[PDB]
Design a protein around this ligand. Structure first.
Ligand SMILES: C[C@](O)(CCCc1ccccc1)c1cc(C(=O)N2Cc3ccc(F)cc3C2)ccc1O
Length: 208
């Protein structure tokens, strides 16, 4: 069973601009995804200081980059905390809450403020290079979910029956035909060095 959701109006407008722009500096999509992987890895790591059991779903904390020229996909896999179904719907489309209003609400509720920024908006830059994005994600004590969109104003969420992940997030970028440089080892190495060199987790490029 598949559920379809509309992007919030301003996010839909942003995605339309991203899809139709000739913006030159497209390589920064990778920085934005690796940065969210690193934040997800920090989260399961800090959380495992008070609850060591949260790493039963996988001890290693890392990021893998997997180009596939046959499928024309670039996959980014991390073993971070992963996303719940609510995280997918709320943060990857339907809600755009200001950090300030979220901060006020957290103060009044006595809740922590660590998520007042959601996951940001920089990751929509993936549509500079991808015509479709699939996200497979697995959070502890929740099921494995697949999120998908080709940026036509909507996205889908379904329970994933594919290969189990353990814990974390996998972003599959189905690249546009003119953006296949991001499957080239030399190009990926270059942009990791320029924009993601100081991430505090191993970033491993898989060779085809
Ligand atoms: C959002 C993404 O950036 C997915 C975006 C795909 C997409 C691309 C383009 C358009 C829509 C969606 C992303 C999310 C995650 C994840 O599991 N997080 C994030 C985070 C930050 C802090 C935190 F404390 C806990 C978590 C959980 C990992 C890698 C990612 O890369």
């Amino acid at each position: 069973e598949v559920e379809t959701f509309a992007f919030q109006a301003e996010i839909a407008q942003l995605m339309s601009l991203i899809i139709n722009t000739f913006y030159s500096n497209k390589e920064i999509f990778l920085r934005e995804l690796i940065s969210n992987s690193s934040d997800a890895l920090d989260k399961i790591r800090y959380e495992s200081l008070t609850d060591p059991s949260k790493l039963d779903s996988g001890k290693e904390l890392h990021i893998n980059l997997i180009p596939n020229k046959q499928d024309r996909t670039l996959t980014i896999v991390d073993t971070g905390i992963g996303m719940t179904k609510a995280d997918l719907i709320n943060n990857l489309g339907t809600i755009a809450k200001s950090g300030t209003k979220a901060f006020m609400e957290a103060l009044q509720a006595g809740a922590d403020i660590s998520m007042i920024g959601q996951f940001g908006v920089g990751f929509y830059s993936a549509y500079l290079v991808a015509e479709k994005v699939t996200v497979i994600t697995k959070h502890n004590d929740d099921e494995q979910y697949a999120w998908e969109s080709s940026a036509g104003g909507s996205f889908t969420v379904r329970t994933d029956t594919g290969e189990p992940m353990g814990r974390g997030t996998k972003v599959i970028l189905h690249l546009k035909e003119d953006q296949t440089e991001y499957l080239e080892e030399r190009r990926i190495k270059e942009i990791v060095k320029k924009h993601s060199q100081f991430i505090g987790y191993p970033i491993t490029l898989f060779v085809e």
